[PDB]
């Protein structure tokens, strides 16, 4: 009886009080899904469990201990069972688009068989070629437009009513979303940090009185030169949903942002300079001075990279629905020719989402496409779980190439031990890479 | 004025209703930290924002759209400001424990300088060596038992009152927690799922009535064995808080778990035998046969592995507190010699948590150790945020070796379409001896009515 974290719900209704149809999560259940519960809480949040127990936020190391809270972690009295497992991503090596698609679509155990069986369980007829007795075998896969069509070989003869009407499965509308968090890197070569300029001087306090509460601020322009190569052509189509700053490898600081909604192959380099402003607040005793210092650096890196691009696509099933046994919610018996498309990947809408339909299967008002409860009666809960798990298995494509950067930046305005009682040659700092160094 | 995600608080008090001292997040704020809010929500969770907007769970692709929710994402009417930023990990290459420790405590920009400056801002006197004017410089790094000491070089004479009393920073009590989710793997050395045998035959229905009330069930035992290596000796002290299952790689569905509170280096292999059974409830018409096929597979896999172990340690600062300028809440003026240990890593208690003391800084009853507000008035908010972010910056050590696994498993039971003959009868030969020598034991195909 494993709790599903995605069904946990937090309520703020007093000690051990839950929303209708919910009951409080106990200490044991909380422990089994500790990482998931804590990852839904604020830093110093403290939330209630069953029977005078409490779970603390990530700031408190997520400790489960006795105590009181006016808010409560809760779980459905009648949870939804048999969630679809999320298997691990199917990694596909980098290459040209047509080659990455090819790999995926001719994959019998990972693609053809699960998508054929999906169609078969829904009630689609004759999902298999004439050269075999089993579903998802003897399956022709054909390039067609921007997509691919999988369909039982229809050559020769066959037995069974309307066996010539083989169902087809079209996969189309491929999209590739680069996930920054998947960032790997090869052997790091060029990786050094060199101090170029170390500015010095004094901050003098003459007035007979200890001096403090004055900032010796600094401002200047940093710089970052970067580039990168794309080993293959898939990169021409991959984008990233959100703009992100290129990651920080080694000690060489970087100020690079990858723009979202823009080809990865169209973002191969850049150059930026930003007006920063280090700061410091001294406390120099009466009639004394202090040694101030500001260091300037020049660093650069070079390393082969790799991100993961999440592959998504539309799955379109067309063929006729079997007499006296199909999953369409009206359960038609006149063998209608049917078309449905599921979006395999990010959620677009209810009609095209297996996971939405699956998880709402026990809400009558919601069943307007497939009757997933019927697939379970017919084929067993675990059988459907496994099939859907494989149909919905995240596919990932590698995005490779070489990277190389360079940046100049200042350090902290450090101030040292005072002594009983600062020049900025712009032409010098200009030629060092630091322009507009107005301290 | 940025919204701080870890201050958001979900309330279930009705449409647009927040708890005392909180008010509804608005669409604008929620978009700016969208990924963070969505990652705190259940799959198909839907929660209200201000002014008729709603934010949706990761099931719904984290969409912000019009709607009405009885639960509301909320945010302090009076938020705690200037949070300590959270820098990206400092990553240390795998190695023996000493080397890893060495790389850390001899890292000037990333360790020596930030821990020195922290000692300095807290008010510890003489945090620097005699051969420099600046704090954190000319700093002697010395091995001291199981830990390390950082302290300004005191060679010779120096100018200043009690200048000979250099402040010491001692790092001790390291711990290395393996983060399951940091898993990454090299190019798969060996990989393949091999068909070793296919069981084929027929299931027959002899009666004159269509039959669909019986299960055809396969059951069998399969061994799964696995082993791993640990490149270095740091692993002999690495552990994970909670047990976890070994990441799935390739199609080789494996059932392996690393136990908690047990050294990584002590879990290098194992074998499990599981009794598995799968079934089908075929409908077969009067006087007909259905083909049946069960494919059996051998799966083996190999690859270099690498996790990250989050590195934690105690930071003990010892020296005297300066006159007319120290951070201790009482603000002693008699230069008392002070000793204080911070835990750098997972929280243990209020007293030793910079992150806790910082975020609570504006609550007068919570100020029982250091006065972080004073450090802000003396040095500026940004100066402190940047120093503290440096000292709390996540330190991760790589944990490596090789992984290799081996299993056997059956594919699903597959049935074809009914053929007329020229309560279900099976004609599917099974050789116990051959199957056993193939790794499949106690193998049986059964026909029985199910419930």
Author numbering:
A (entry chain A): 2 to 422, 445 to 462
B (entry chain B): 2 to 423, 440 to 468
Quote the paper.
Aerolysin is produced by the human pathogen Aeromonas hydrophila as an inactive precursor called proaerolysin. Conversion of proaerolysin to aerolysin involves proteolytic cleavage of a flexible 43-residue loop near the C-terminus. The protein is L-shaped, composed of a continuous globular N-terminal domain, Domain 1, and an elongated region consisting of three discontinuous structural domains. Domain 4 has no known function but contains the CTP, which is folded as 2 anti-parallel β-strands connected by a short α-helix.
Residue His-132 is required for heptamer formation. Our MD-based observations thus suggest that the CTP remains bound to aerolysin upon proteolytic activation of the protoxin. This was confirmed using two independent experimental approaches. First, we determined the structure of the proteolytically processed form of an aerolysin mutant that is unable to form heptamers, namely H132N. Not only was the observed structure very similar to that of wild-type (WT) proaerolysin (root mean square deviation RMSD of 0.74 Å for subunits A and 0.92 Å for subunits B in the dimer), it also contained the CTP, in an essentially identical conformation. The structure of aerolysin H132N and the experiments of binding WT aerolysin-CTP to Nickel beads indeed show that the WT CTP does not come off over a period of several hours, which is inconsistent with a Koff in the order of 10−3 s−1. Thus the binding of the CTP to Domain 4 inhibits oligomerization.
